[PDB]
């Protein structure tokens, strides 16, 4: 019921006024020929926190190489109440990555990742390539997370569109929050179980 | 078949001539390394005395 | 029951 | 009670079938009657990925040959390939198919005995009696023509719309990087120093007309510069004056890579809006009527 | 582990080799590594382990270690396989120094692959450390006679560990080079070419006794005066029961050889 | 005579002197116009 | 114990083939690759010492002076002498 | 009442 | 060309 | 004939082989007496420092 | 648990 509710909110079955025609064509062509691990990634995006990367680490800080796996423990739930304004959050849905950054993100974290002094010093276009460029250990670990989810799938081609809180491109992130309520379906997972239990 | 099994017997043992002298040469360079190490300890011990 | 302020979004 | 028999057969599933990453099922067991499956209210089926990547720690697909006999042992009725789930009778002289049930004969080069359990004694010795994924070496009766090389021919839109968006320069950089990455299929990665990337590479660009890029070397051994042959007949497609429109990449390493570098600069000042991609993909067909391959459009 | 090992391991900058490293590798790569292999064929004693180290380490920089192993395997089975009469065989061959250094060196080896190798031999070596502790044999009495009568229960414990081990439980890097050595030795034996002939079992058994584990035992464990004491403790790092256990494996491999020959 | 490593030690010293002469001509051109 | 190793290597090499990547440690420092280049460039030069005046003892019974003097080695000596251009000669 | 449990 | 005989010449000119 | 010359060849290899194990044992014992003499001189150098 | 803290948080 979680994954079915995922494809209702996805681009495959959204109402017409919010997804164009040829976007739905490519979503249907993907879903008819993708493997099961990429279809469930499309209907259930995986969310990771990036602002507390120093917290989720051992006392040895086991060197980040891929020889041993780049450590990615926490898979966050897909609802807005665990979102925190001082946080960065990476979401992948098998097609694109969206890196939501809050307004109250730490400037020390921003200078480590993108080398920017402020959130206004970041635009969605170039900051995908700016990750890990400043060579600070915090931002290099962010690039470790981005490349790990990139190579975990079959193909290493999956664009990264960084989103600040307050830009017009924020709605593509918040629509992928499947447990939330989006402009397509105004139902959470709690209400959707209730609707399919009285119908059953 | 007699020569097939007997090819197999020195395809065997020509790689243990390779194995035995591999132990000889790698340990003889330990002998070279520890003899230079001997000279540097006895010289510095004489300087310390 | 479920009130106005109590069922907004925290974000 | 009535669950120990289920978990034994479920154990036979997990240790003889084709692995999870090749085949994945909706349900591990099936209903017996049509009345049961209508009350199930969930679909039944499989996902098949025949060339799936093998995870480390998991066995690769073994290769099984049949020697000079050249006969892959097959059922006569449903033509189902040999699998570890057939049933062997008359001390292995006959085998019943587990799909259509016909009792086929065992070939004379396949004569081996049986153990106490009814299975064959060399069941683990031959790879296709124990694993669900096997790769056979098919004989000459399954080929209609000799095996064609890996072949690629790139269609690049070079209209004023595409050169403004940078599609012409993004695609050419990608094609150059993929051909020089060293992982090109058809290059002999079994390492013996010899000039035999059998891969076939062609280049076609298109706008209101269709352009063909001659890439072969000169007959005198000189390094011929690449050519651009415009073809404006967008109703009845033909091939221009060359036999080097579709060349081998190893013998023409320098010409293909140079022509990829020239394409963004050559069509940079193109002011033509309309495109005839339908004629261009037909144009790629006339090039590869004799080999085949892939258009990267 | 410290910050410098983090910095040099997934930064986009310091994985690209230098310009001097690039053109050196091009000249060593043309014609199936024949200029590279002739230099190590032309080597000496002490110089051979340094050029085996240098050839392998530059191979890791260009991600061409499978190319180096596959080229070195066929050219050394061919060289061992077509030089009759011979001698003490004139500074040995390349294949055994190569496999010893590739699978046992602090810079070719993963932390995950090393930590597996600690946890399959810590009970083996704790058996040897309990023999020196409970029967109170001193260091001098260790080196007098053969270690097979010293560590008799400790060695048989190691046989029990390997018996319950498997190639699936062997990690990806050892298990890969068993398979590439197996289908190369079988291929150059069958020079006019599958039952895995006992020469491949013979080479596989050698590399998993002395090359993997024996070299593992060799490694894993007033200012001028203090640094020389520490360099002594690093060089003579065995409080000898470790090195007697090592030479127990090397002398084991000679009788492991006499089993496969018979 | 000069054979092997002494050729490489020769080319290293002239390549060093070329870099050295480039950077002191760089400074002396600033100094003369100053 | 040796026979047990024989029966072990015969059995797991007979087990069906496993996919196994050869993927080695990235913890190699660039200084490790730097002394790797330094040992190559120095050994090519010291080999030129042993050719002109006879000191070259081979590591192969049959690899003569003519066998190591390939045209490939002649180009490697051109690299070994002219290396100091683009190598930043404070290092190797 | 409930700040013992829900805190 | 102008004979790029340094390590900085192949950087700045390329 | 192809087994007779190839038995003289295979015998010369075993004569190289059991001789090789000879100075495998001998080179081990010279390492034994050379490593135990390090033990006294490192003790004297430790006491002198 | 997480409920009553968020009703106070919105309010």
In this structure, are residues D245 and D256 in contact, taking their beta carbons and an 8 Å threshold? no
Handedness of CA E216, E217, E221, E223 (dihedral sign): negative
Q: Which chain B residues have a beta carbon less than 8 Å from that of J3?
A: 2-3, 6
Give the residue ranges of DSSP H helices in A114-181: 137-152, 171-175
Under 8 Å CB-to-CB from G90, ≥6 apart: which residues?
A: none
List D48's β-bridge partners, or say none: D23
SS (H, E, C) chain G: CHHHHHHHHHHHCCCCCECCCCCCCCCCCHHHHHHHHHHHHHHHHHHHHHHHCCCCCCCCCCCCHHHHCCHHHHHHHHHHHHHHCCCCCCCC
Residue F27 sits at the chain I interface (C-beta within 8 Å):
no
Under 8 Å CB-to-CB from A164, ≥6 apart: which residues?
A: A101, A103, A119, A122, A124, A170
In this structure, are residues A176 and A93 in contact, taking their beta carbons and an 8 Å threshold? yes
Looking up tokens 């010369």, which residue turns up? J12
CB count within 10 Å of CB E82 equals: 9
Q: Which residue of F has its CA nearest to G79?
A: F8
Distance CA A100, CA A180 (A): 16
Distance CA C1, CA B41 (A): 87
CB count within 10 Å of CB D296 equals: 14
Phi/psi class of residue D67: alpha, beta or left (left: φ > 0; alpha: ψ in -120 to 50)?
Answer: left
- Backbone phi, psi, residue A5, to 5°: -65, -25
In this structure, are residues E239 and E132 in contact, taking their beta carbons and an 8 Å threshold? no
**Which one, of E185, E190, E194, lies nearest residue E260 by Cα?**
E185
Residue D20 sits at the chain A interface (C-beta within 8 Å):
no
Query: For this experimental structure, what is the resolution in angstroms?
Result: 3.5
Q: Which chain I residues have a beta carbon less than 8 Å from that of G86?
A: 6-7, 9-10
Residue F7 sits at the chain G interface (C-beta within 8 Å):
yes
In this structure, are residues G37 and E24 in contact, taking their beta carbons and an 8 Å threshold? yes
Residue G37, Cβ density class (10 Å: 0-12 exposed, 13-18 middle, ≥19 buried): buried
Residue D60 sits at the chain G interface (C-beta within 8 Å):
yes
The tokens of A121 are what? Answer: 């010093």
Cα separation values, E181 from E14, E83, E189, E203, E219, Å: 32, 21, 12, 8, 24
**Which one, of D12, D249, D51, D39, lies nearest residue D149 by Cα?**
D249
Identify the experimental approach: cryo-EM
Nearest to B21 among E88, E95, E100 (CB): E88
Q: How many residues are present in chain D?
A: 297
Distance CA D13, CA D21 (A): 15
In this structure, are residues E84 and J9 in contact, taking their beta carbons and an 8 Å threshold? yes
Looking up tokens 């680490």, which residue turns up? A57
| Strand residue runs (E) in chain A | 46-49, 88-92, 97-101, 160-164
Three-state DSSP state, A191: helix
- Backbone phi, psi, residue D187, to 5°: -75, 130
Q: Which residue of B has its CA nearest to E228?
A: B41
Cα separation values, D8 from D12, D14, D130, Å: 6, 10, 17
Under 8 Å CB-to-CB from D123, ≥6 apart: which residues?
A: D84, D115, D129, D130
The tokens of A119 are what? Answer: 């959130």
Looking up tokens 């382990």, which residue turns up? E49
Q: List b or e across A186-196, with b for residues whose CB sees 16 or more CB atoms inside 10 angstroms.
A: ebebeebeeee
Residue D120, Cβ density class (10 Å: 0-12 exposed, 13-18 middle, ≥19 buried): buried
DSSP E119: T
Three-state DSSP state, E156: helix
**Which one, of A106, A99, A147, A105, lies nearest residue A124 by Cα?**
A99
Looking up tokens 């006895």, which residue turns up? B42
Q: How many residues are present in chain A?
A: 200
The continuous run of DSSP H or E covering J23 comes out as helix J5-48
Distance CA D54, CA D189 (A): 18
Q: How many residues are present in chain E?
A: 262
Distance CA H4, CA E108 (A): 56
List D294's β-bridge partners, or say none: D152
CB half-sphere exposure, D274, CA atoms < 13 A: 8
- Backbone phi, psi, residue B4, to 5°: -75, -40
* Long-range pairs, A101-104, Cβ under 8 A, ≥24: A101/A162, A101/A163, A101/A164, A101/A165, A102/A165, A103/A164, A103/A165, A103/A166
SS (H, E, C) chain D: CCCHHHHHHHHHHHHHCCCCCCEEECCCCCCCCHHHHHHHCCCCCEEECCCCCCCCCCECCCEECCHHHCCCCECCCCCCECCCCCEEECCCCEEECCCCCCEEECCHHHCCCECCCCCECCCCCCHHHCCCCCEECCCHHHCCCCCCCCEEEEEEECCHHHHHHCHHHHHHHHHHHHHCCCCCECECCCCCCCCCCCCEEEEEEECCCEEEEECCCCCCCCCCCCEEEEECCCCCCCCCCCCCCCEECCCCHHHHHHHHHHHHHHCCCCCCCCCCHHHHHHHHHHHCCCCCCEEEC
Interface of G with A (CB under 8 A): 23-27
CB count within 10 Å of CB B20 equals: 25
Q: List b or e across E224-253, with b for residues whose CB sees 16 or more CB atoms inside 10 angstroms.
A: eeeebeeebeeebebebbbbbbbbbbbbbb
Under 8 Å CB-to-CB from G64, ≥6 apart: which residues?
A: G58
- Backbone phi, psi, residue A116, to 5°: -85, 150
In this structure, are residues D287 and D281 in contact, taking their beta carbons and an 8 Å threshold? no
**Which one, of A94, A99, A107, lies nearest residue A48 by Cα?**
A99
Residue C10 sits at the chain K interface (C-beta within 8 Å):
yes
DSSP E150: T
Cα separation values, D26 from A106, A171, D46, D48, D83, Å: 46, 34, 6, 12, 22
Distance from CA of H3 to the nearest CA of K (A): 9
Q: How many residues are present in chain H?
A: 7
Distance CA D132, CA D52 (A): 14
Under 8 Å CB-to-CB from E251, ≥6 apart: which residues?
A: E146, E147, E148
Distance CA A149, CA A138 (A): 17
Distance CA G11, CA G6 (A): 9
**Which one, of E240, E70, E209, E63, lies nearest residue E147 by Cα?**
E240
Q: How many residues are present in chain I?
A: 14
Distance CA G41, CA E72 (A): 21
Three-state DSSP state, E73: helix
Q: Cα-Cα-Cα-Cα dihedral of D63, D69, D72, D75, to 10°? A: -150
Which chains are within 8 Å of E by 3+ CB pairs?
A, B, D, G, J
**Which one, of A34, A40, A36, A35, lies nearest residue A2 by Cα?**
A40
Q: Which residue of A has its CA nearest to E116?
A: A68
**Which one, of A192, E116, E257, D297, lies nearest residue J24 by Cα?**
E257
Distance CA G33, CA E55 (A): 10
DSSP A120: G
Q: How many helices (H) and strands (E) does chain I have?
A: 1, 0
Give the residue ranges of DSSP H helices in chain E: 3-10, 19-27, 30-41, 46-61, 65-80, 95-102, 111-118, 122-134, 139-144, 152-164, 172-189, 198-206, 215-217, 223-235, 241-261
Distance CA D205, CA D211 (A): 5
Q: A-C interface: how many C-beta pairs under 8 angstroms?
A: 6
Phi/psi class of residue A61: alpha, beta or left (left: φ > 0; alpha: ψ in -120 to 50)?
Answer: left
Distance CA A57, CA E190 (A): 52
């Amino acid at each position: 019921a979680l994954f079915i509710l995922g494809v209702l909110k996805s681009n495959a079955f959204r109402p017409v006024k919010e997804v164009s025609t040829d976007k739905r064509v490519f979503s249907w062509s993907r879903l008819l020929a993708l493997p099961v691990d990429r279809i469930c990634a499309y209907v259930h995006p995986r969310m990771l926190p990036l602002h507390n990367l120093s917290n989720f680490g051992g006392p040895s800080d086991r060197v980040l190489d891929g020889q041993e796996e780049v450590i990615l423990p926490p898979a966050l739930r897909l609802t807005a109440e665990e979102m925190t304004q001082d946080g960065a959050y990476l979401l992948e849905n098998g097609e694109e990555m969206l890196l939501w950054i809050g307004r109250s993100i730490s400037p020390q974290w921003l200078a480590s990742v993108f080398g920017a002094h402020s959130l206004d010093c970041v635009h969605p276009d170039v900051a995908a390539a700016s990750i890990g460029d400043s060579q600070d250990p915090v931002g290099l670990r962010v690039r470790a997370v981005v490349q790990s989810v990139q190579g975990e799938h079959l193909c290493n081609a999956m664009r990264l569109l960084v989103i600040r809180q307050g830009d017009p491109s924020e709605q593509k992130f918040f629509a992928q929050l499947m447990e939330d309520r989006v402009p397509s379906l105004l139902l959470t997972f709690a209400e959707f179980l209730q609707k399919v239990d009285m119908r059953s | 078949e007699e020569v097939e099994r007997y090819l197999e017997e020195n395809r065997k043992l020509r790689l243990h001539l390779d194995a035995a002298n591999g132990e000889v040469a790698a340990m003889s360079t330990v002998h070279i390394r520890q003899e230079k190490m001997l000279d540097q300890l006895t010289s510095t011990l004489a300087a310390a005395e | 029951q479920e009130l106005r302020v109590s069922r907004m979004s925290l974000m | 009670s009535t669950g120990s028999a289920a978990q034994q057969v479920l154990q036979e599933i997990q240790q003889f079938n084709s692995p999870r990453y090749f085949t994945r099922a909706s349900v591990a067991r099936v209903p017996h009657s049509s009345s049961l499956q209508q009350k199930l209210h969930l679909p039944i089926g499989l996902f098949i990925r025949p060339l799936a990547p093998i995870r480390p720690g998991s066995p690769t697909v073994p290769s099984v040959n049949f020697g000079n006999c050249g006969v892959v042992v097959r059922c006569k009725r449903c033509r189902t390939y040999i699998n570890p789930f057939v049933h062997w009778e008359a001390h292995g002289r006959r085998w019943s198919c587990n799909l259509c049930g016909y009792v086929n004969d065992t070939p004379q080069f396949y004569m081996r005995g049986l153990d106490e359990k009814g299975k064959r004694e060399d069941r683990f010795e031959r790879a296709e009696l124990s694993m669900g994924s096997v790769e056979f070496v098919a004989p000459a009766d399954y080929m209609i023509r000799p095996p064609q090389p890996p072949a690629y021919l790139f269609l690049i839109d070079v209209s004023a719309t595409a050169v403004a968006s940078g599609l012409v320069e993004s695609a050419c950089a990608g094609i150059r990087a993929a051909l020089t990455s060293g992982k090109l299929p058809g290059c002999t990665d079994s390492g013996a120093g010899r000039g035999d990337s059998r891969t076939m590479v062609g280049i076609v660009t298109y706008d209101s007309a269709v352009h063909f890029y001659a890439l072969g070397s000169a007959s005198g051994g000189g390094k011929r510069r690449p050519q651009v042959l415009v073809m404006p007949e967008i109703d009845d497609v033909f091939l221009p004056l060359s036999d080097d429109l579709f060349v081998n990449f190893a013998e023409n390493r320098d010409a293909v890579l140079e022509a990829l570098d020239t394409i963004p600069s050559l069509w940079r000042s193109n002011g033509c809006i309309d495109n005839c991609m339908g004629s261009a993909v037909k144009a790629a067909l006339l090039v590869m009527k004799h080999v085949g391959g892939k258009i990267l459009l | 582990e410290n910050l410098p090992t983090l910095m040099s391991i997934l930064s986009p900058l310091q994985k690209v080799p230098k310009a001097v490293c690039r053109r050196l590798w091009n000249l060593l790569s043309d014609n199936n590594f024949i200029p590279l292999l002739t230099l190590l064929k032309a080597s000496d004693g002490d110089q051979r382990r340094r050029l085996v180290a240098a050839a392998c380490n530059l191979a890791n920089s260009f991600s061409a270690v499978p190319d180096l192993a596959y080229h070195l395997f066929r050219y050394e089975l061919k060289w061992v396989g077509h030089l009759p009469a011979s001698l003490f065989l004139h500074s040995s061959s390349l294949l055994f120094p190569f496999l010893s250094f590739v699978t046992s060196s602090k810079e070719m080896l993963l932390p995950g692959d090393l930590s597996w190798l600690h946890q399959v031999m810590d009970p083996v070596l704790a058996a040897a450390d309990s023999i020196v502790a409970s029967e109170h044999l001193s260091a001098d009495q260790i080196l007098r006679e053969t270690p097979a009568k010293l560590f008799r229960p400790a060695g048989s414990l190691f046989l029990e560990r390997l018996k319950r081990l498997s190639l699936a439980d062997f990690p990806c890097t050892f298990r890969g080079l068993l398979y590439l050595l197996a289908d190369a030795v079988d291929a150059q034996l069958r020079e006019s070419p599958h039952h895995v002939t006992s020469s491949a079992i013979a080479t596989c058994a050698e590399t998993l006794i002395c090359c993997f584990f024996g070299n593992f035992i060799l490694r894993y464990a007033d200012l001028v005066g203090l640094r020389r004491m520490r360099e002594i403790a690093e060089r003579s790092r065995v409080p000898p029961t470790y090195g007697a256990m090592d030479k127990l494996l090397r002398q084991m491999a000679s009788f492991c050889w006499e089993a496969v020959s018979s | 005579r000069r054979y092997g490593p002494e050729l490489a030690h020769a080319f290293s010293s002239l390549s060093d002197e070329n870099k050295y002469l480039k950077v002191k001509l760089q400074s002396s051109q600033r100094a003369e116009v100053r | 114990a040796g026979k047990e190793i024989v029966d072990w290597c015969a059995l797991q090499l007979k087990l069906p083939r496993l996919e196994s990547p050869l993927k080695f440690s990235s913890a190699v420092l660039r200084k490790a690759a730097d002394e790797a280049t330094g040992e190559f460039l120095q050994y090519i030069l010291r080999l030129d010492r042993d050719m002109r005046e006879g000191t070259f003892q081979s590591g192969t019974p049959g690899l003569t002076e003519r066998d190591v003097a390939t045209p490939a080695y002649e180009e490697l000596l051109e690299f070994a002498i002219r290396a100091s251009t683009y190598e930043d000669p404070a290092s190797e | 009442d409930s700040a013992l449990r829900r805190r | 060309e102008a004979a790029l005989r340094n390590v900085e010449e192949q950087f700045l000119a390329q």
